[PDB]
Scaffold this active site. Structure first.
Site, PDB file in Angstrom:
ATOM      1  N   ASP A  96      -7.843   7.992  15.495  1.00  0.00           N
ATOM      2  CA  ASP A  96      -8.231   7.632  14.132  1.00  0.00           C
ATOM      3  C   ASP A  96      -8.663   6.171  14.059  1.00  0.00           C
ATOM      4  O   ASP A  96      -8.199   5.388  13.218  1.00  0.00           O
ATOM      5  CB  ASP A  96      -7.055   7.883  13.214  1.00  0.00           C
ATOM      6  N   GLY A 136       0.795  -1.227   0.000  1.00  0.00           N
ATOM      7  CA  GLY A 136       0.000   0.000   0.000  1.00  0.00           C
ATOM      8  C   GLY A 136       0.826   1.274   0.000  1.00  0.00           C
ATOM      9  O   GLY A 136       2.055   1.231   0.104  1.00  0.00           O
ATOM     10  N   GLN A 137       0.136   2.409  -0.114  1.00  0.00           N
ATOM     11  CA  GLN A 137       0.775   3.721  -0.217  1.00  0.00           C
ATOM     12  C   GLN A 137      -0.168   4.816   0.271  1.00  0.00           C
ATOM     13  O   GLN A 137      -1.388   4.613   0.314  1.00  0.00           O
TER      14      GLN A 137
HETATM   15  C1  LIG Z   1       5.335  -0.417  10.213  1.00  0.00           C
HETATM   16  O1  LIG Z   1       4.334  -1.385   9.973  1.00  0.00           O
HETATM   17  C2  LIG Z   1       2.999  -1.074   9.963  1.00  0.00           C
HETATM   18  C3  LIG Z   1       2.405  -0.167  10.836  1.00  0.00           C
HETATM   19  C4  LIG Z   1       1.032   0.064  10.746  1.00  0.00           C
HETATM   20  C5  LIG Z   1       0.265  -0.615   9.788  1.00  0.00           C
HETATM   21  C6  LIG Z   1       0.872  -1.535   8.934  1.00  0.00           C
HETATM   22  C7  LIG Z   1       0.150  -2.280   7.866  1.00  0.00           C
HETATM   23  C8  LIG Z   1      -0.605  -1.639   6.877  1.00  0.00           C
HETATM   24  N1  LIG Z   1      -1.029  -2.644   6.068  1.00  0.00           N
HETATM   25  C9  LIG Z   1      -1.862  -2.431   5.018  1.00  0.00           C
HETATM   26  C10 LIG Z   1      -3.057  -3.133   4.928  1.00  0.00           C
HETATM   27  C11 LIG Z   1      -3.979  -2.963   3.904  1.00  0.00           C
HETATM   28  C12 LIG Z   1      -3.787  -2.053   2.874  1.00  0.00           C
HETATM   29  C13 LIG Z   1      -4.910  -2.005   1.839  1.00  0.00           C
HETATM   30  N2  LIG Z   1      -4.989  -0.992   0.788  1.00  0.00           N
HETATM   31  C14 LIG Z   1      -5.703   0.247   1.027  1.00  0.00           C
HETATM   32  C15 LIG Z   1      -7.135   0.181   0.473  1.00  0.00           C
HETATM   33  C16 LIG Z   1      -7.411  -0.659  -0.785  1.00  0.00           C
HETATM   34  O2  LIG Z   1      -7.681   0.214  -1.888  1.00  0.00           O
HETATM   35  C17 LIG Z   1      -6.330  -1.706  -1.131  1.00  0.00           C
HETATM   36  C18 LIG Z   1      -4.923  -1.395  -0.616  1.00  0.00           C
HETATM   37  C19 LIG Z   1      -2.604  -1.313   2.925  1.00  0.00           C
HETATM   38  C20 LIG Z   1      -1.678  -1.499   3.983  1.00  0.00           C
HETATM   39  C21 LIG Z   1      -0.593  -3.836   6.516  1.00  0.00           C
HETATM   40  N3  LIG Z   1      -0.792  -5.170   6.002  1.00  0.00           N
HETATM   41  C22 LIG Z   1      -0.189  -6.181   6.670  1.00  0.00           C
HETATM   42  N4  LIG Z   1       0.574  -5.980   7.771  1.00  0.00           N
HETATM   43  C23 LIG Z   1       0.789  -4.740   8.286  1.00  0.00           C
HETATM   44  N5  LIG Z   1       1.557  -4.619   9.398  1.00  0.00           N
HETATM   45  C24 LIG Z   1       0.186  -3.649   7.627  1.00  0.00           C
HETATM   46  C25 LIG Z   1       2.229  -1.740   9.028  1.00  0.00           C
END
Ligand SMILES: COc1cccc(-c2cn(-c3ccc(CN4CCC(O)CC4)cc3)c3ncnc(N)c23)c1
Length: 256
Positions: free
Chosen positions: A129, A19-20
């Site tokens: 949040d 993700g981003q």
């Molecule tokens: C420093 O490490 C951290 C801290 C806080 C959160 C996350 C995290 C975020 N994600 C994550 C999950 C879902 C998405 C989904 N995404 C946004 C909406 C949708 O359009 C599809 C792509 C993006 C990131 C994780 N997934 C799997 N494991 C994770 N740890 C994460 C990691």
């Protein structure tokens, strides 16, 4: 001077992009440890600001909060945590598995979030949040707290008064996400309408097939006066015991 969370960047291999917003990657740590890695894309926010999240994650340790593993606190800055292999609750709810979830699964998920937040509560912290997009899902439908006017209590949105009680408000809204398989709260309402209507006493009605007892709980979470709102400790116990103490005659319906 670094602390005992510090690791060398060389120990990290950022494999699969997730993700981003910087970014988040699937990856590896030292030998055979699967992790998630948050990156800071230069410019967007200060080192100190990106290291808000890690510094709080250092002091918060609980089964239902995503666990910090490590930090690279010099640029390019990285935060490292356990890997949550089902991604965000919001994406899960809206996804292909989402539609099979019924109220027993959804309430259990809520109980787990309440438990992590009960811990946040005991530690005297505030999340700010809280919502399905910031809940992470792992194996066995484990939900952990990680990381929005529609989710934000009025006193907080209007006056910046974020307390654990405004987190409770957000949790009420999160219950609507759970019970609608991830629909945006206040369907068809822009942020201004939501502000305006909420201020005049409007609350979301009971979602279709949501038992009234669960809606009443939402309403308690949405009491005007923050102090009249339940504690997460209370929410955790209620949701944990829901199908015995509160809705012992629950039967599955079309969707919940
Ligand atoms: C420093 O490490 C951290 C801290 C806080 C959160 C996350 C995290 C975020 N994600 C994550 C999950 C879902 C998405 C989904 N995404 C946004 C909406 C949708 O359009 C599809 C792509 C993006 C990131 C994780 N997934 C799997 N494991 C994770 N740890 C994460 C990691």
């Amino acid at each position: 001077a670094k602390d005992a969370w510090e690791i060398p960047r060389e120990s990290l291999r950022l494999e699969v992009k997730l993700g981003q917003g910087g970014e988040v990657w699937m990856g590896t740590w030292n030998g055979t440890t699967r992790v998630a890695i948050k990156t800071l894309k230069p410019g967007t926010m200060s080192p100190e600001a990106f290291l808000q999240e890690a510094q709080v994650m250092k002091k918060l340790r609980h089964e239902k909060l995503v666990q910090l593993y490590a930090v690279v606190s010099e640029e390019p800055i990285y935060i490292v945590t356990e890997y949550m292999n089902k991604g965000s609750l919001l994406d899960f709810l809206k996804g292909e598995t989402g539609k099979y979830l019924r109220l027993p699964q959804l309430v259990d998920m809520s109980a787990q979030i309440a438990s992590g937040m009960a811990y946040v509560e005991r530690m005297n912290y505030v999340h700010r949040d809280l919502r399905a997009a910031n809940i992470l899902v792992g194996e066995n439908l484990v939900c952990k707290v990680a990381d929005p006017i529609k989710w934000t209590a009025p006193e907080a949105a209007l006056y910046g008064r974020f307390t654990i009680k405004s987190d409770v408000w957000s949790f009420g809204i999160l219950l609507t996400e759970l019970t609608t398989k991830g629909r945006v709260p206040y369907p068809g309402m822009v942020n201004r309408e939501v502000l305006d209507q909420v201020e005049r006493g409007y609350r979301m009605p009971c979602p279709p097939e949501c038992p009234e007892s669960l809606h009443d709980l939402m309403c308690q979470c949405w009491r005007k006066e923050p102090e009249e709102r339940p504690t997460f400790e209370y929410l955790q116990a209620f949701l944990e015991d829901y199908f015995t103490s509160t809705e012992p005659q629950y039967q599955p319906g079309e969707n919940l």
